[PDB]
From a paper:
FRHABG dimerizes and forms dodecameric assemblies of about 16 nm in diameter with a spherical shape and a hollow core.
Based on the four X‐ray crystallographic structures obtained, we confirmed that MtFRH shares the basic organization previously observed with an elementary dimer of FRHABG heterotrimers that further builds into a dodecameric unit. The electronic path is highly similar to structural homologs, despite variations in the occupancy of the protomer‐bridging [2Fe–2S] cluster and FAD, which is likely an artifact of purification or oxidative damage, as the only reducing agent used during purification and crystallisation was dithiothreitol. FRH structures are superimposable without any movements between functional domains. The only noticeable difference is an N‐terminal extension in FRHG that forms a β‐hairpin, interacting with a β‐sheet of FRHA, which may enhance the thermal stability of the enzyme.
Author numbering:
A (entry chain D), B (entry chain A): 2 to 393
C (entry chain B), D (entry chain F): 1 to 282
E (entry chain C), F (entry chain E): 2 to 241
The structure:
Amino acid sequence: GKIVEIHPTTRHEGHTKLVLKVDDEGIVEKGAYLSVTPVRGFEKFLVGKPAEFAPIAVSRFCGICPVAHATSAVEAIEDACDITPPKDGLLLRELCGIGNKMHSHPLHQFLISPDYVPKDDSNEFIKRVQAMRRIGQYIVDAVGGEAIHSPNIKVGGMAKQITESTKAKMYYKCKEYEKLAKEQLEYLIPIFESRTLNDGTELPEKLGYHDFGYIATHPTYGDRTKIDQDKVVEYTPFDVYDKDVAIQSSTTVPTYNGRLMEVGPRARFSKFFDFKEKGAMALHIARAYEISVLVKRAMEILDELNVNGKTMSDEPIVGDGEKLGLGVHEAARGHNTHQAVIDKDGNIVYYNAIVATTWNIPVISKAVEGTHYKFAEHIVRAYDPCISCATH
Amino acid sequence: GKIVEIHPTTRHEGHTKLVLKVDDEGIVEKGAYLSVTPVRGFEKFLVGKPAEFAPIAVSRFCGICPVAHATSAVEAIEDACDITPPKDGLLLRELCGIGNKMHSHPLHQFLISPDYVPKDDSNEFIKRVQAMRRIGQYIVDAVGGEAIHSPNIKVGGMAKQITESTKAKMYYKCKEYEKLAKEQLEYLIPIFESRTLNDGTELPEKLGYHDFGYIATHPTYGDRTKIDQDKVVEYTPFDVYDKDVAIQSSTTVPTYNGRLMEVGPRARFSKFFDFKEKGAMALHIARAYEISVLVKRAMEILDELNVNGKTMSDEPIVGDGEKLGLGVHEAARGHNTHQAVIDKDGNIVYYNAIVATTWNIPVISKAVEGTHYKFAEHIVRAYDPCISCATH
Amino acid sequence: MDPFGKYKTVVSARAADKTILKKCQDGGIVSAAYIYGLENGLLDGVIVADKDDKLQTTPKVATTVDEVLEAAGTKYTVCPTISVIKSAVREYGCEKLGVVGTPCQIIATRKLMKYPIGFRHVPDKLALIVGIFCMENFPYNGMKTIIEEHCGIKMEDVAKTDIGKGKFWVYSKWGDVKSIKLKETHPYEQQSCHVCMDYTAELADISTGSVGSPDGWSTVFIRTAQGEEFFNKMVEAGALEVKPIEEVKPGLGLVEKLSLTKKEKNAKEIEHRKEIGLPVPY
Amino acid sequence: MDPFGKYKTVVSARAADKTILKKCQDGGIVSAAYIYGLENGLLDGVIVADKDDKLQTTPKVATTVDEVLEAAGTKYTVCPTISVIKSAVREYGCEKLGVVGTPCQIIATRKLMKYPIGFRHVPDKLALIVGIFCMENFPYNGMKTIIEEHCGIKMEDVAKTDIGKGKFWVYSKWGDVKSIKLKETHPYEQQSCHVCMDYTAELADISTGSVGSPDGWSTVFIRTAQGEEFFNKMVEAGALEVKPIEEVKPGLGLVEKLSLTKKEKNAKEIEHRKEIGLPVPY
Amino acid sequence: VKIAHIHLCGCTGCLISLADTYEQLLDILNSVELVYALTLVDEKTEIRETDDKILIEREIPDDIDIALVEGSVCLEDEHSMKDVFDARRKSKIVVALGACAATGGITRFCRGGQMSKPVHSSFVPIGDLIKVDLALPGCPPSPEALVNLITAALNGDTEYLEIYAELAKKTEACGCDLLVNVINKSLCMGCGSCAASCPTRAIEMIDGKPNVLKELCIKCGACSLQCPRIRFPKLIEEIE
Amino acid sequence: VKIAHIHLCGCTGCLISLADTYEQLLDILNSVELVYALTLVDEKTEIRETDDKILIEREIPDDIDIALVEGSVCLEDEHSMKDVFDARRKSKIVVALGACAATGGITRFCRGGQMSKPVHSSFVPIGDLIKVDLALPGCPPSPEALVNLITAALNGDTEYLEIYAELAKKTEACGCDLLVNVINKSLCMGCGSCAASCPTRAIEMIDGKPNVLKELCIKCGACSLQCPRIRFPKLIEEIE
Ligand SMILES: Cc1cc2nc3c(=O)[nH]c(=O)nc-3n(C[C@H](O)[C@H](O)[C@H](O)COP(=O)(O)OP(=O)(O)OC[C@H]3O[C@@H](n4cnc5c(N)ncnc54)[C@H](O)[C@@H]3O)c2cc1C
Ligand SMILES: Cc1cc2nc3c(=O)[nH]c(=O)nc-3n(C[C@H](O)[C@H](O)[C@H](O)COP(=O)(O)OP(=O)(O)OC[C@H]3O[C@@H](n4cnc5c(N)ncnc54)[C@H](O)[C@@H]3O)c2cc1C
Ligand code: NFU
Ligand code: NFU
Ligand code: SF4
Ligand code: SF4
Ligand code: SF4
Ligand code: SF4
Ligand code: SF4
Ligand code: SF4
Ligand code: SF4
Ligand code: SF4
Ligand SMILES: [Cl-]
Ligand SMILES: [Fe+3]
Ligand SMILES: [Fe+3]
Ligand code: NA
Ligand code: NA
């Protein structure tokens, strides 16, 4: 019968707090994971601003996944204005998203390496991570114009064509990345499967179990037709936390058919690759296997791409001031949603974002229950939470 | 055998210089009237800027006639984008143009009153001018939002509807303006017809004669179909002045079919009201009579106006990046031309302005020849030159 | 420090119009003054804070009595009433304009009248400047959290809110009355209100509030000659029921206490900001 | 006052390619450097200033020999060559970029290499920075007035322009050659050039120009190790014809005179700007 | 008092705003001596006659008390540069009349290249070159704000003019002043008076806060001048 | 040397930019001691046990040599305010890492009203509250720019850091800096390097001059920092 508060949690992005009610043996009885980051309030300040500013602004949700928000932003505005991006722009947009995730998953494995990677292997492990991230960031730089906040992701497609030279360079680097991925996967999967931390502590078998479903519209990009957004309702922290904790939470509470949902690699691997494992370790494992899926798709996109095909649509950014445009994207951390209303002048009338980690925060709160509070952060990190992302 | 330079000229807007070659009896042999105002360069800095900024920006050409430039700007961008302003927005826009001219003509009469109005009549004369300007400025305030630089003049029509109350007020004030105008006209026309200044100086009968034609597209508003803009070519000061004067000139030299043309009230009164008189006094006279034409037309617009009718088009500002939109407006000082190319995003690709006094400056240069240099400035003022306008 | 600013007389007052009393927040002084001016040609347009179904506010140039009655009642969220002050005198063509506002908005009005840089032909058209008392305002989603999450009532179901007796009050359309301690509302208040030094709208022609007078009645400060004329005309016309503030409970002493409390608390914040280098009005 | 900045050697030089000499402004050093590097994998992209039929400049990332040849020749108007330096290494994918520009643009390039705040992964991909000498530049419409109104030649009809022997030269496509005294061009020059303290592009790897060398040859400053390695590779390959600047007329003394004249004239402008309060680089 | 209107790179709209005191312009012009204003008076005429040239020049007179200087200075125009220093040399009080003179306003966007003076590309408020004693922002400042300034100058109302004397030290203006000085600093209380002050309607109140449509802002300074959370001198509290 | 990364109201992109030194990040982290960074290390952990609560806090340690402070400060958030003063208290050298910390950046546009903290509306660069020793603009500053700063900090290259020590006194930035400080001042020679510097491609070179798409400007200060007509220290003239 004690309250355990861990604050801030560490080795994820952003500023959160774990508020736990534990029993006399330390087992979490009631869990609360919550963002306490200030709300910069992008959705609100975007009202009154031109549509072209939306991908630029929302990129600054997060410097780890900026591509995911620019992509969801333009997909929302394109849906609002019935703009079709051309075939090769859409290929380059998905490539740029994949490049971001190709840096994010290794980065996360780098953040959890203090718990899972033996000290003696740390330097070689981090070198491999940074080599993989170097390639993923090169793809975002080349196609998006900048690795961290890509101005080439625009309403209408992608701003700039690459050259056959650049295309061939990204293909070569993807092949190398694939080799590093095979090395990384063969090393980490046995560790995750051992359920043992690098100090030898064994993790509970039921670590991070929960009863919630998953949302994933696509394995590598996004598909607004695979979700009924009318069934998505955002509730308040008071609906999931105690009053004293709810008033500290900075995020909304996304539900689907009134239910919390998990997003991210395991949700994707569940929907598309018949991955059925529950628990926190399965999250790390799905994320690890997803690195291979991404680089395979990136090369596939490059084989498909016509570097001379048009990448920007010629259609103007003209809305009717009513349609709630939907833009979904499978961010590194999960199903990421932007919505926008656009008027005839292309200005933003209404803007909304339901970010991947916004879904997972209330899931994490439940997932940490039933095991010792000493394992709670390890469950948190399995979800690769991004809190500036979730808060925006 | 002497050069006469008068610098600056006065009792007109902006910064000009008279450079005259006179014979031994003081008769001007070669005339040069030229703006030496710095070129603020609106046409150049408008490139790359959004269309909606153009009526705002070009308004600052001149604080006496800003309505003329906003009107031409929006009419040009409308032409470029095939936007049609709704009936009542167009009526309010023309009313705003007329109210501006209803302030400008009395203002010019105030500026010339030192030369034509007896000292003893000055105060009463000025009070009548200001009473008339107050009514003219009220119309532009009420309909354009500000009397000096009207933000309501916008691509698509007019931003704000007026109330029946506001409409009824302007009608009452126009009736009062018409009373003042009859008083002003009956006082000023005999003076102008007497060819005598208020110091007894008799003016030559052929004062300000020239051989050039006129351009006027409408008596109160503007009609881009009444001019073939392909025949309008802008030349340099070197094509009309000696080298040492030409380098000082800040304006371009507008021609129609290779020839200089006069614009302004006399041009309009010659095209539409069978006014055939040459010379400078016929300019003062046409300007004086146009005051009645204007207020009569304002009341006729108010009688036609539907205060509840749409004033802004719902059409977006979308161009093809190629069409050179044409916007013409009969400013107080004459035919005023703005041109614009607009891309699919509503941004200004190219922008040009041929302002009323830009036409008139090289005409004034020839008009001052043949009479004594002591009359050159009176010929200048007869054209009501606006130089910040002409230079932009 | 001084509690009320400059005034000619403070009274407790109430509109005589029964209709106004059904719709207003307190005595109905603002609606009574607006409706009286409109009906008697002393005002040809009045600025009001309106609301929608969810209590979101929109500033508006009202020209009819019905518009004044639809805007009656307090919305405890920010409504930029001054934002329409030029539209009112331009396309609306008002020459006898009534303005309502919280002290800060009243302050903004006196400032634009003194230094009318962007207010060509506005100042000479302001006929009556009505100030309402104000302790603090809130962003809409702040007040939405207070009502929906702390009072458990949907914004659509709100018929009226109020502040008094130490509590925030929600009156449901369906009969319920929920109150919470005001300390629960403080985390949601617009933090720029914490430098505000004006409680009773000290620069208005007429300032009116609820504190100091009983329920259904208003505490009214008559400050300026323009307010004194307007108010007397209303009184002579029978449009207001008036009682001396000395004859009413809890009286002027509560207003004094609350005003000096705001001034003292916010002077501390002003000094704290100056101490840490943040800008403060001067 | 130092005249040339830092350098290893100064030569007179010329391209050995007859085609370059047909199209280039002087010795064809810039084209020869670019073409040699592209042809030998020393460079995979080069920034050039291109012109249209009216001599309007456009900065561009050239990747072929034909594109370098089409950009040969001086355009005496402002071309923002550095504005494409990021595109060059992003979507163009250049890892061995050649840069050319007037001294000011070379100054800009050295600065973005030293303080690359907005130049992620740009500095290491600059393989050769080539400076051209510069006394002053012109807005397009100023040079248009010089050519059309002082030299009587249409911009369409201009095949080449030049500055030398105290005059500005227009070579028409139809055979005519018109010259005017340089004092006639000064009213039209970009006035921000009047604070420029760099004549021979003192911060380039290789700096090349016309003064000091005879017609068809260039004065070349070899400044950095990168430039030295590049220039020597071209010489050992027979890409360049080289003569000692001592053995050539008018020689380095004319370069010293013009360089010091620019620095002396423009230091006075800098001090004049400081004197009246105008900002100056520091 | 001797007053003069100096027209630099402006549009004359500020003078027109003064003219829009209407019949009261005669009261203003009767309370002072308009000694110089090319638009209104033929001053100060000086005739120099050689054997081959008659030069009739209208010069800025000496001993000006109050110079209403309108427009910005073009650095590439010698006469523009000469005029702004001339006005300063010859005037006791220099008033930056309007945003062009006070902060540069619309002319901040000038970048040159237009005929027939393509090198005219650099425009600065007059305070970047000369000492300014009072600055009136806006585009144009209202007739009422001009009346009040002239009345205060003539009556020695130093207190009223302090805000404009303080502005005279400010040569940059932008809608971002509301963000950087009010909204960002927990001072904006959502009165909306800034939005009502904007001549271009660039400011839109959304959810109780100003949104600045930056591409519509002409850097006029009206909004920052209005905001009572920036300047609120005690004299505003004085009511009937 | 003991360095820390303080993450205020940032996006962590500046830290990612430091991570995008890729393998060389091990050389950076081996040349210093990373004593604090919530994203990277479990520091500084302190456990407080009472009868009813176990509080596990990761605090900012004392005796920080170089604080890499990223993000702006939310005036309405008490923890944000506490962290920025704590960072200054505990660090000998405070580096405003990135536009958000240096000049507000994208958070300049925050105006509040968003769940679940609708009163969060006022974001300021850290220098509006604490003394900043060095500011790195850009959104984010390049990895190369960061390497050079850290190297100069560690090696005592005062001359190299002077431009950033000067920026530290500047808490506002805008694309209009190019206008106000270069184009308007007859200093712009049209190199176009500002355009290449911009992360949002808000700058367009038109007829040799920068055109700033102001609604695309996120106020990062990268253009202003690059422009050699503003700052050009002699150290740039050194070549090899
Ligand atoms: C945020 C806020 C805080 C307040 N705090 C206090 C307080 O601490 N003590 C106190 O005695 N009184 C306070 N008041 C005033 C009180 O709530 C009543 O509004 C006031 O007494 C006038 O009531 P009435 O019956 O006389 O007028 P009514 O006839 O009910 O009309 C009220 C008028 O106020 C206007 N209005 C409504 N909401 C707003 C708004 N958000 N902003 C601007 N104008 C608005 C409407 O246009 C309406 O015309 C506050 C008001 C507000 C908006
Ligand atoms: C505005 C200006 C002023 C100059 N003043 C002088 C001077 O006073 N003294 C002197 O000795 N030399 C001067 N030069 C340089 C000279 O004109 C030649 O360009 C130089 O000698 C290089 O010629 P080249 O035959 O070696 O190379 P080329 O093979 O002819 O190619 C020249 C290269 O310069 C680039 N270029 C062309 N125009 C421009 C431009 N406007 N901006 C940037 N790059 C451009 C082209 O991309 C091309 O690749 C000036 C050049 C310019 C643009
Ligand atoms: N991946 C990821 Fe983000 Ni920083 C999260 N959570 C975004 O959509
Ligand atoms: N009338 C007029 Fe203007 Ni001031 C001139 N010339 C405009 O179009
Ligand atoms: S407390 Fe002051 S600042 Fe806040 S709303 Fe009330 S009057 Fe305005
Ligand atoms: S003179 Fe200097 S500033 Fe002008 S173009 Fe040449 S190098 Fe650039
Ligand atoms: S501030 Fe505005 S009204 Fe005044 S001169 Fe300048 S452009 Fe004209
Ligand atoms: S005037 Fe000032 S306080 Fe009022 S809304 Fe504008 S910025 Fe906020
Ligand atoms: S926002 Fe409006 S009032 Fe403020 S400076 Fe810009 S144009 Fe002027
Ligand atoms: S400066 Fe840019 S990249 Fe850095 S924290 Fe702020 S938003 Fe993120
Ligand atoms: S970087 Fe060059 S082009 Fe940009 S403002 Fe500075 S001088 Fe002009
Ligand atoms: S223009 Fe570009 S580089 Fe300059 S501050 Fe704005 S976003 Fe940053
Ligand atoms: Cl841990
Ligand atoms: Fe959200
Ligand atoms: Fe023109
Ligand atoms: Na000329
Ligand atoms: Na505070």
